[PDB]
Amino acid sequence: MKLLVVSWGDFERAKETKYRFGGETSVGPSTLPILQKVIKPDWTVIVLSDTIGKDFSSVETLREDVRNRVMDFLDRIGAGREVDVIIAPGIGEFTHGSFRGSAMDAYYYVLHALSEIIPTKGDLEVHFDSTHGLNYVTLLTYRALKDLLGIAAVMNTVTFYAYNSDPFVPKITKELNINTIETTMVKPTPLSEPLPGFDEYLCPYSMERAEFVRLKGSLNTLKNLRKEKKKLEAWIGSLLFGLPLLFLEEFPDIGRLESYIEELAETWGGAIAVNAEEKAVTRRLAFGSGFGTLVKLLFQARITRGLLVEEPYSIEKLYSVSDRLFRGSTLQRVRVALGKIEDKAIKYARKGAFPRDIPLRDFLGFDAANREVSPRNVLAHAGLEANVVEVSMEAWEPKRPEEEAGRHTHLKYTPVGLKKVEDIVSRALKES
Amino acid sequence: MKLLVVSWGDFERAKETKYRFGGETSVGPSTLPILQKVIKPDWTVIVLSDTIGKDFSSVETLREDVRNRVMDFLDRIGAGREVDVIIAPGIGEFTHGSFRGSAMDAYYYVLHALSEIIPTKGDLEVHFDSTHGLNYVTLLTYRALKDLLGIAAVMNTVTFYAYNSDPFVPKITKELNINTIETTMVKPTPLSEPLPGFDEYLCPYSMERAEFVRLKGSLNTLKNLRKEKKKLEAWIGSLLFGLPLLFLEEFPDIGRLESYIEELAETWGGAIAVNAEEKAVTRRLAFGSGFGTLVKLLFQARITRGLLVEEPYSIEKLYSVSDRLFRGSTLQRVRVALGKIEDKAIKYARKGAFPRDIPLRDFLGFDAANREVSPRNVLAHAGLEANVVEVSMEAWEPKRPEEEAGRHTHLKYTPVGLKKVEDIVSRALKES
RNA sequence: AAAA
RNA sequence: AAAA
């Protein structure tokens, strides 16, 4: 899949020039037609600031004005309708109207929008044009794109190309080359932050205390998050630290994560004030880092949901999941931890023993004496510490016990064991 | 250390305006004075494109013209002269001049310059202003700065703030807010790139192939680097995968890395052709990703050189190096590996026995079953594999042997063991 | 609890 | 080349 993302400012103010790109040439006010002709992408995203809009009767009319002006300009330059348009919240005082709010709303808004567009299945070839962009929208869009692509790179091959034309200068420019400014294979970077404090999801920009306190207390989302926070941090730590059983057992509820992000986004939306008379937009609520973390968390769950299975969870599944999630010494750590349990399983099966509901301590033949659960042992043994894991082997008639034992031996956390694992992993994440 | 980095284009064409920032107010053509007043940095860096240059016979004439116009503008506005100016290789055709080369040279040049300015001891508070920047020079400078700060964060606390003013509309705007667009605690990111093939240090942009193959063959750098490559990759993998003994034994020669980077940078500099009459700059050689990797590699060595000591290496020294360098399950694996060696050493010291130069396999009491060195066992056990490591206890009179064994027990790779480990770690870095 |  |  080939994805073209372009950063635009006041696109209607661009002068007619010509562009050079992939040994093609082109005449007009935009790079987008020659980029589409050479790169031939499956999908195009246009990112710009709402600060070009002029219809101040309401928020939906402002977006409608900006969107009509993009669609009119696409027909003019001949670029086709097969496009997504991200209308980011911009800032500044202009003659045609006034736009106020946190500038970082643009990062959170674009991140949210891109998280619903970037495919969560298959390889990605991503092309980014900064040519026409505002400094601030371009930098925040670059950053949001890189953050989600780093997460998609845990499951899939992700390549990224950046473009920028030579500087335009009126009255002297004959033609602009579209330069390559980046060519990267994106490294896998799983989410590596805890969920923050409840002061950090939605922040007052210009809303008084009575309205904010009442609004913050009205949100189901912050109530339900208080309750799941430690479970979600447990899951984040499972990709970061190499804990394949914790990855499956703490796998988040995607419907639930959707409704948290929906409720925060539409509360941010409802707090935007549009004054038709003064031609002022005030974004009275600002997004905080916690909204960004939730968006990334949902995206990471969509990227990895292919690996989630129906319990019970076998050694063979834990190998299979681990091969997709983990690399380097992390992956070898997991294979050493799983291998020790698999070896004992092969020996039991060889002698027609099939233990059920047995603590991992007993299965491995450890001392009943060492039942304290340390951070050190939970983290250094892929989360499979002998005092928190229970083992069950299915009974079968073995023929090749060395190939068969692994799929027939199931592991789960004990109820008590899970809660101690959750505490250790949550705590290790927060002291990163 | 507080560090201010600024991104400038045609700084002289900016209009007088009012800036708001940190409760202060400033009237001027530049953000720089109000940024310096409010942030009070220890050091300022200005990054701009050489494509502003006017009457050039030579590279030195180009750079003098540009530097002199920056110093005129600094004096004219608030700012002082405790300033580095990075004059970056830019691109495009302008009234006064024509600049041809790889646009990505700006990234490698700014990365090289910042690697010689950003301090490599102590915490970093870094401020980045993009308001006056060219789109392409701004992204490449942001990226370069983030790449180096990620390495610095392995050893020190690094915080990063980015700023961008509201958009300027000519003749209309009056006051401009300087907005915050990023606040970040920079995550530790050790270098995760292998050194590339020998075609990726310097590439012809505009050079005859006879001239290029002759230059290549004349470079001591590429000859020496052919010999050192696997060793340098072993050391990169040691921080990445958690191998504290390999980190000490393969610690690279800083004087030689300096020499390789200066030869590549000097060669790129001399391949730059200036035609006085047609006012044309051609950078005949482009920097490749391998110049980037050598710069990051020298920086990560400077950041970590305070941890290095001479042989021998105690279990106590390896705990402390691991405590500074490693986190999560990587550190807890180091501690378990080292702890098993210490435990066994206490048992020997209790019996008054002080064995020397003994294979780790024999020291731990391993049998004969396997003597092969698997990537799995090297990477999963913090590079302390049983067949490649030799243990020496240096005899003392034990009183509290459980407190004393760590000081007096030393580990070393065997000469044959070091080679296999290098091959395994080098290959792991290249696959992942 | 031979690589727990 | 502060809405190429």
The secondary structure of A54-89 as a DSSP string is: --TT-HHHHHHHHHHHHHHHHHHHT--S-EEEEEE-
Query: Which residues partner with A100 through β-bridges?
Result: A282
Query: Which residues are CB-contacts of B160 (< 8 A; sequence separation ≥ 6)?
Result: B126, B128, B146, B149, B182, B183, B184, B186
Rounded alpha-carbon distances, angstroms, from residue B375 to A337, B242, B325, B386, B388: 15, 14, 22, 12, 12
The boundaries of the domain holding residue A334 are 313-430
**CA-wise closest residue to A66 among A28, A114, A109, A11:** A11
Chain A residue with minimum CA distance to B182: A104
**Neighboring chain A residues of B177 at a CB cutoff of 8 Å:** 91-92
Same-domain status, A87 and A165: yes
Q: Does A94 touch chain B (CB under 8 A)?
A: yes
Same-domain status, A85 and A180: yes
Residues B254, B388: Cα–Cα separation, whole Å: 27
Residue B214 lies in a domain: yes
Residues B168, A136: Cα–Cα separation, whole Å: 12
* B62 in Cβ contact with B69 (< 8 Å): no
Of A255, A274, A307, the residue at which a domain comes to its end is A307
Q: Does B393 touch chain A (CB under 8 A)?
A: no
Q: Does A196 touch chain B (CB under 8 A)?
A: no
Q: How many domains does chain B have?
A: 3
Residue B194 lies in a domain: no
| Alpha-helix residue ranges (DSSP H) falling in B25-58 | 32-39
* Chain D: bases < 7 Å from a protein Cβ: 1-4
Q: Is A412 helix (H, G, I), strand (E, B) or coil?
A: strand
Closest partner residue to A93 (CB to CB) among B166, B182, B335 is B166
Q: Do B181 and A139 touch (CB under 8 A)?
A: yes
* Chain C: bases < 7 Å from a protein Cβ: 1-4
* A35 in Cβ contact with A6 (< 8 Å): yes
Residue A195 lies in a domain: no
Residues B244, B383: Cα–Cα separation, whole Å: 8
Residues A50, A374: Cα–Cα separation, whole Å: 53
Closest partner residue to B138 (CB to CB) among A91, A106, A135 is A135
Position A120: which residue type?
T
Residues A67, B274: Cα–Cα separation, whole Å: 47
Same-domain status, B288 and B404: no
Q: Is B102 helix (H, G, I), strand (E, B) or coil?
A: coil
Of B307, B338, B356, the residue at which a domain comes to its end is B307
Position A279: which residue type?
K
Of A265, A291, A307, the residue at which a domain comes to its end is A307
* A9 in Cβ contact with A133 (< 8 Å): yes
End-to-end Cα distance, chain B: 35
Same-domain status, B238 and B327: no
Q: How many helices (H) and strands (E) does chain B have?
A: 15, 18
CB pairs under 8 A between A and B: 153
Neighbours of B186 (CB within 10 A): 19
Residues A229, A222: Cα–Cα separation, whole Å: 10
**CA-wise closest residue to B24 among B39, B14, B11:** B39
Same-domain status, A242 and A118: no
Same-domain status, B132 and B216: no
Residue B191 lies in a domain: no
Query: Which residues are CB-contacts of B135 (< 8 A; sequence separation ≥ 6)?
Result: A130, A131, A133, A135, A138, A164
Q: Is B287 helix (H, G, I), strand (E, B) or coil?
A: strand
Residue B190 lies in a domain: no
Same-domain status, A119 and A234: no
Same-domain status, B14 and B159: yes
Residue A289 lies in a domain: yes
**Neighboring chain A residues of B243 at a CB cutoff of 8 Å:** 329
Residue B197 lies in a domain: no
Range B78-91 burial, b when 16+ CB lie within 10 A, else e: ebeeebebbbbbbb
Same-domain status, A161 and A213: no
Same-domain status, B303 and B318: no
**CA-wise closest residue to B248 among B305, B323, B324:** B305
Same-domain status, A218 and A174: no
Experimental method: X-ray
Encoding tokens for residue A377? Answer: 């042992």
Q: Do B380 and A135 touch (CB under 8 A)?
A: no
Burial of B16 (0-12, 13-18, 19+ CB in 10 A): exposed
* A261 in Cβ contact with A112 (< 8 Å): yes
Q: Is A35 helix (H, G, I), strand (E, B) or coil?
A: helix
Residue A191 lies in a domain: no
Same-domain status, B246 and B327: no
- Bridge-based pairing of strands A83-88 and A43-49 is parallel
Q: What is the CATH number of the domain that holds A52?
A: 3.40.50.10640
Residues B412, B417: Cα–Cα separation, whole Å: 9
Encoding tokens for residue A348? Answer: 């039991």
The long-range contacts involving B167-172, CB below 8 angstroms and separated by at least 24 positions, are: B167/A9, B167/A51, B167/A92, B167/A134, B168/B14, B168/B15, B168/B17, B169/A94, B169/A95, B170/B15, B172/A94, B172/A95
Q: Is B413 helix (H, G, I), strand (E, B) or coil?
A: strand
Cα angle value B90/B91/B93 (rounded, 5°): 130
